[PDB]
A paper describes a structure:
[name] was used instead of GABARAP, since purified GABARAP aggregated during concentration. In both structures [name] formed the same canonical [name] interactions with [name] for the [name] WT [name]-GABARAP complex. In the [name]-2pS [name], the phosphoserine [name] formed a large network of electrostatic interactions with H9GABL1, K48GABL1 and R47GABL1, while [name] was not interacting with [name]. In our crystal structure phosphorylated S12SCOC formed a large network of hydrogen bonds with H9GABL1, K48GABL1 and R47GABL1, whereas phosphorylated T13SCOC was solvent exposed and not interacting with LDS amino acids of [name]. Notably, in the [name]-2pS [name]:[name] complex structure phosphorylated S18SCOC was solvent exposed and not interacting with [name]. In the [name]-2pS [name]:[name] structure electrostatic interactions with the more distant [name] [name] domain residues (E10SCOC (X−4) and D11SCOC (X−3)) were not detected and may not be required for [name] binding to [name] due to additional interactions established by phosphorylated S12SCOC. Phosphorylation of S12SCOC in position X−2 of the [name] [name] motif increased [name] binding. S12SCOC phosphorylation enhanced the affinity of the [name] [name] motif to LC3s rather than GABARAPs. Since the LDS of LC3 subfamily proteins has more basic residues at the edge of HP1 (R10/R11LC3A/B and R16/K17LC3C on helix α1), a larger network of electrostatic interactions with acidic or phosphorylated [name] residues in position X−2 to X−4 can be formed, which promotes more binding to LC3s than GABARAPs. Similarly, S12SCOC phosphorylation rescued [name] binding after deletion of aa 6–10 (positon X−4 to X−8).
Residue numbers in the entry:
A (entry chain A): 1 to 115
B (entry chain P): 12 to 19
The structure:
Amino acid sequence: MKFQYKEDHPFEYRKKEGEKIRKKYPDRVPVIVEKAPKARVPDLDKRKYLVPSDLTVGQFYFLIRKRIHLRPEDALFFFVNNTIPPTSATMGQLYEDNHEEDYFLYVAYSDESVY
Amino acid sequence: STFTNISL
């Protein structure tokens, strides 16, 4: 999927951090958020997040739109494992169903509805 | 490497 976070961090390091943070914060989930390749939108100022497990995917989506300063008129989509996630899922549910072997959840965003 | 915390 090409996340710069993976390019910058050896797997063993990611897995150790993800396991530790999930044990430490049972009510939060570790999430990497990055702009998809080719997307015509801003990069986020931060890519590594600790997100409340009860926040919904839809709420997190609107928060990300604000953090990249997107006008409400503009398009944006999330991709998790190359799939647009259900907006009513909580971030904890999305994490449980989609975290990688390093215990991080990865979310890409794009102005195009295809990753 | 710090995490950015999202508040509820």
